[PDB]
Symmetry: D3
Subunit: 133 residues, 6 copies
Amino acid sequence: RDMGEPKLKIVAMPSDTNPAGNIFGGWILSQIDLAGAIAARELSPERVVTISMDKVVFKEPVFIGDIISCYSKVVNVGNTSISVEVEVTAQRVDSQGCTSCINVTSALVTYVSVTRDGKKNPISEELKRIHGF
Amino acid sequence: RDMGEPKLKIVAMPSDTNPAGNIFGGWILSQIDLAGAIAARELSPERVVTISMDKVVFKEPVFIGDIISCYSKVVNVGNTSISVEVEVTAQRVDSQGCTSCINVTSALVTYVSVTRDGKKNPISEELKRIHGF
Amino acid sequence: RDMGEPKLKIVAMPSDTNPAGNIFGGWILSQIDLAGAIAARELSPERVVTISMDKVVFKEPVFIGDIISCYSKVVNVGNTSISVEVEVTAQRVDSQGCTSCINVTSALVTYVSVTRDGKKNPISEELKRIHGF
Amino acid sequence: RDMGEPKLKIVAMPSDTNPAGNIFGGWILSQIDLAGAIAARELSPERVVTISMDKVVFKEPVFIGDIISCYSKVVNVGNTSISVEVEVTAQRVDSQGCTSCINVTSALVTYVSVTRDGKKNPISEELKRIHGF
Amino acid sequence: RDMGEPKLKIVAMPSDTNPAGNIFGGWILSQIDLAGAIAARELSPERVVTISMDKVVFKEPVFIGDIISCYSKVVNVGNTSISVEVEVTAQRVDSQGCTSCINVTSALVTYVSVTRDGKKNPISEELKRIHGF
Amino acid sequence: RDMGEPKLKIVAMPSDTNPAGNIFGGWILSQIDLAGAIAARELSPERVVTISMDKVVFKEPVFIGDIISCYSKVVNVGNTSISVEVEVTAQRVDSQGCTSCINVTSALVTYVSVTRDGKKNPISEELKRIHGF
Ligand SMILES: [Cl-]
Ligand SMILES: [Cl-]
Ligand SMILES: [Cl-]
Ligand SMILES: [Cl-]
Ligand SMILES: [Cl-]
Ligand SMILES: [Cl-]
Ligand SMILES: [Cl-]
Ligand SMILES: [Cl-]
Ligand SMILES: [Cl-]
Ligand SMILES: [Cl-]
Ligand SMILES: [Cl-]
Ligand SMILES: [Cl-]
């Protein structure tokens, strides 16, 4: 971890649980999709649409009260496509009062850079240059 | 398509949109996670926990008003793990009054079969037998 | 039960509860209204508006985790109006691991067939014919 | 109208709409179920469970921004059951700046008076007496 | 208390809680903002926008099941601005069956009277006159 | 601005709007309450309860799509109480593709440091020392 500051930071609320009582995986995946998009828009400011998700791993349960931080690293840039590794950490306090930070979920999301009306937008070589591509 | 009847069937509501106006991908992924789980619990009735997601593809936009159907096929069964292909279709009516059914998203989700308190539960050979494994 | 496959199929989530801890009746009624509408639109593809509800019976409590299936039967068709019986079943697993399916709620909903801009649309005699009217 | 002050008073928010853009009927029915319950608990303070709904009429569309008021009249009291007429009004401002109040929906809801753990509670003759029964 | 009837009256639902299990303060503040606005629009029917909040006090916890009533008093009127004191009460039933009404939160909210497109609207001297200003 | 990194960072979604179409002030206030709490818990790890809010200013409208960042500065520490200035910024892209960052709302929130069961917890002098008090 050293992939910048979080793109998203949310509290997990009691309304975001699954029938077992843990934070619903679909709520996490929502955070991932949104956090990745913020990262991808650095290469495509107006709009991106999510085209795929690979290698998502639910490493650890998320609980009510966790502060969830979503970190992003743009991993790949094509002509219009943008790949983002998203790492989710949960910040948690136990009974004794100790703060733990747990790497909780992981994903590889791909976006396409588009015009605000949804047509393919080739990514500018300048933004690629300032991002190491 | 012929992977049984849908495991989930929901209407996409105006509250489930993204900033562009299409149905939010994270809402779809929630449907996928839940629909896969219903399929996986056929091999593990009490509880499953979602451990991973691969090969999710947002093939087509989802709109307000779409009836979303989530179909599932258990693709693989291990000692405790269960793989599920989830296919999402949107049922849609155009201006002229024509109903279209669009294969809208796709995913491969993996679950672990667990006790209601979250400990690994080896899948019974009987349920594997009646499901073709 | 033999009124086709479900028009809706949803999981009851912890966020859908009432102050007592059972699944909120208003959430169920939402499912009923939506499931009936899908059935009514078979006679009026573009749009229906809900005009009334009769004979709704909360036969049994709904719990967190239940898979709720909403079945529909078009009971009556007028010149513009459409009556639908909606039956809700909850699929549930007990402690020992046994799956139970409980007829949980019931309703008679009436819709009017309208244009996408909300004006009365007389139902086509063809759609009435292919639905036994 | 003169059935006391409203049991519920809510603003209809943009998130409470149906695919057409009007306020979702299921959201209204939620308000009705809750408003009726407040009225029924005057005869059964601890808890009521909703057992049925009759004669619900969607007289008029509800829009974003409407202030919805739910009025209640206990219509009938049995040994454990309580019938409530619920009337919903929408308070609305047009383009010119004129406030209109529209009787928007109607329902007859029945509740059973129960103990906080859900067992039938015979209604006290005193509360019946002070409510005209 | 004698500042008219409530401008809002809602049930606090289990989905409106914070990680501790009490009703989330932000949900209450939403009720306050909306209830104040209804009061302010008596001086500006079309639209108000919220410009500030002072002197909000969380006097007492709010619980699941509470009937929350929001009372309002227009405290001050300027050329375009409107100040509103909002008082929130929770109606609650204990174990023995006793109803308690608790003054639960307090706030001073300020609104600006605007045109439906958001430009400053000077408040009419007539509406000021009929409201004691 | 230089009060550390954001305590919260969320996207404003279409479901978070008011009847006018701007992001609902109550949704913002929720973000403020939560972001302040994260800051206050640095002085009281287990739990804080929100006791008051002063000097909240809605400086600018928030729109759908904005990335909202909530910054916090602990302004004052008493024996059990904690004051936090919360500043909200909206990150926004216009038509031409230009990113703007707008200071959008402001608040002074006060928390009490409590035990996980809600009793007053005197703040440790050590945590005060490492935070400049
Ligand atoms: Cl889950
Ligand atoms: Cl999109
Ligand atoms: Cl999306
Ligand atoms: Cl889980
Ligand atoms: Cl209920
Ligand atoms: Cl409608
Ligand atoms: Cl509707
Ligand atoms: Cl109940
Ligand atoms: Cl709170
Ligand atoms: Cl506004
Ligand atoms: Cl607002
Ligand atoms: Cl609290």
